[PDB]
Amino acid sequence: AWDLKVKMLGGNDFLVSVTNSMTVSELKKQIAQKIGVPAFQQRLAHQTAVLQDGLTLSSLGLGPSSTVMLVVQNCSEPLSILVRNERGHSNIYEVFLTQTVDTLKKKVSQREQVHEDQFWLSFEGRPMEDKELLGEYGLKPQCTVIKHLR
Amino acid sequence: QIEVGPGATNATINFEAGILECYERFSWQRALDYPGQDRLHRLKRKLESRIKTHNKSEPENKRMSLEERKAIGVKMMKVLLFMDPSAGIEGF
């Protein structure tokens, strides 16, 4: 186990604890734990190559000598998405990617008049957990979320 | 004090819009200090005012939102920064 130098635009840098077997996703989560920038906003690079989230850090040639570059891609603007209930009737909702799955579940609870406990959401099969951010699942404008019942 | 023609008004509104989006993105890296962040706030508001106004002496087909103007600024800056009309096309 060893520490990894993450540099940000501006110049500041900091240190995250990693392993040769840690994935870019696991590393991104580590950064999100360490300084609170959601993983989904993180674009990482190393020697000008962007790091895809699947590979292992050692397989990408990172080591205790390495320095990795972080750029934050946020967004102010909201987006519109669909939530297709079990009966095939979609409804249009306005969401921010920094909002929680929970706050969206509330807009749906209000609109479809269903307790939050009685349903859950999924995106392209990946189930969505209340506490996580909507950006974690790759929502794009006018995409379709499915509502599952109980 | 460089002489310009008219519509440099529109060009400058477009330019400064792109300038705003650079502030927006810079702030996300958490590197914009607190006074700079006010400048971003001020700049956004001064622009929307200038945009609305300009959106009136403009033919209705040529009314562009703050957002569309941002896309135009950004391609301008991509030309200036590399000194290159290639950038701002779609792939540089």
Swiss-Prot record, chain A:
Gene3D superfamilies: Phosphatidylinositol 3-kinase Catalytic Subunit, Chain A, domain 1. SUPFAM superfamilies: Ubiquitin-like. The gene is Isg15. It holds the Pfam family ubiquitin. One of its GO terms (biological process) is response to virus. InterPro entries: Ubiquilin, Ubiquitin-like_dom, Ubiquitin-like_domsf. Induction: By type I interferons. GO terms for cellular component: cytoplasm; extracellular region. Residues 1-75, 76-150 form the Ubiquitin-like domain. The record marks 150 as: Interacts with activating enzyme. The keyword Secreted applies. Homodimer; disulfide-linked. Interacts with, and is conjugated to its targets by the UBE1L (E1 enzyme) and UBE2E2 (E2 enzyme). Interacts with NEDD4. Interacts with PARP12; this interaction inhibits PINK1/Parkin-dependent mitophagy. S-nitrosylation decreases its dimerization, thereby increasing the availability as well as the solubility of monomeric ISG15 for its conjugation to cellular proteins. Keywords: Antiviral defense, Cytoplasm, Disulfide bond, Isopeptide bond, Repeat, S-nitrosylation, Secreted, Ubl conjugation pathway. This is Ubiquitin-like protein ISG15.
Swiss-Prot record, chain B:
Changing residue 25 to A: Partial loss of dsRNA-binding and no effect on inhibition of IFN-beta promoter. Changing residue 44 to A: Partial loss of dsRNA-binding and 15% loss of inhibition of IFN-beta promoter. Changing residue 78 to A: No effect on dsRNA-binding and 45% loss of inhibition of IFN-beta promoter. Changing residue 63 to A: No effect on dsRNA-binding and inhibition of IFN-beta promoter. Residues 1-92 are annotated as: G1P2-binding. Residues 1-85 are annotated as: RNA-binding and homodimerization. A motif (Nuclear localization signal) lies at residues 42-47. Changing residue 75 to A: No effect on dsRNA-binding and 45% loss of inhibition of IFN-beta promoter. It is found in: Host cytoplasm; Host nucleus. Belongs to the influenza B viruses NS1 family. Both N-terminus and C-terminus can inhibit IFN-beta promoter activation and IRF-3 nuclear translocation. Binds and inhibits the conjugation of the ubiquitin-like G1P2/ISG15 protein to its target proteins. Since G1P2/ISG15 is an early antiviral protein, NS1 may inhibit the host antiviral response. Prevents EIF2AK2/PKR activation, either by binding double strand RNA or by interacting directly with EIF2AK2/PKR. Also binds poly(A) and U6 snRNA. Homodimer. Interacts with and inhibits human G1P2 conjugation by UBE1L. This is Non-structural protein 1. It comes from Influenza B virus (strain B/Lee/1940). The chain holds residues 9 to 100 of 281 of the full protein.
